[PDB]
Amino acid sequence: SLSAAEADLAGKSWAPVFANKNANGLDFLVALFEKFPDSANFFADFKGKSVADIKASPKLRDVSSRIFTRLNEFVNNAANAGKMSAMLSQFAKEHVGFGVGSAQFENVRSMFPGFVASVAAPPAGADAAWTKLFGLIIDALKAAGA
Ligand code: HEM
Numbered sequence: 001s002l003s004a005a006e007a008d009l010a011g012k013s014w015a016p017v018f019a020n021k022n023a024n025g026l027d028f029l030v031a032l033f034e035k036f037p038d039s040a041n042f043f044a045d046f047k048g049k050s051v052a053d054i055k056a057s058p059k060l061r062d063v064s065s066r067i068f069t070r071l072n073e074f075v076n077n078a079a080n081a082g083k084m085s086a087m088l089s090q091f092a093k094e095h096v097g098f099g100v101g102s103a104q105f106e107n108v109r110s111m112f113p114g115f116v117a118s119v120a121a122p123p124a125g126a127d128a129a130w131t132k133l134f135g136l137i138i139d140a141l142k143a144a145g146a
Pocket of ligand 1: 042068095098105
């Protein structure tokens with residue numbers, strides 16, 4: 001886990017993003033696919049398709065939402081190793097099932113801070129809190145076999 005301090009910083013930077021959940025959740029998903037095109041392949045309707053096709057999809061919102069709703073729960077529990085344990089196991093177990101592994105989260109990690117910053121400048125130290133949090137995610141993926 002993260003320390004309460006770290007956790008606070010991550011929450012603080014997240015607040016503005018989550019404020020506009022629907023629009024921001026969609027933008028995050030699109031930004032990922034733009035920066036890391038290979039990632040669209042892990043999704044049926046999105047593979048073959050262009051970012052423009054994705055943006056136009058009636059499925060976008062359902063996909064990106066689930067992502068934001070879970071991230072929010074990770075942000076909430078970050079400083080409680082216990083909750084994280086369980087959350088991390090279940091998250092990795094689910095992704096590996098789909099063929100997604102840490103390399104994909106290394107990508108998320110890479111572009112995350114920049115994404116948050118495009119919404120509102122984060123507090124000092126928030127960038128490191130997210131990398132740490134994504135770190136926890138990457139490690140869980142590696143333990144789950146990918
Ligand atoms: C930012 C971190 C991410 C969060 C918190 C997250 C969260 C989620 C959640 C909670 C589900 C289950 C949705 C449901 O209830 O049906 C899910 C499904 C899945 N995720 Fe992630 N995800 C993230 C990153 C990624 C990445 C990077 C990829 C691919 C590169 C990935 C690919 C998938 C796939 C293929 C599914 C299966 C669901 C489907 O077929 O639509 N996710 N993820």
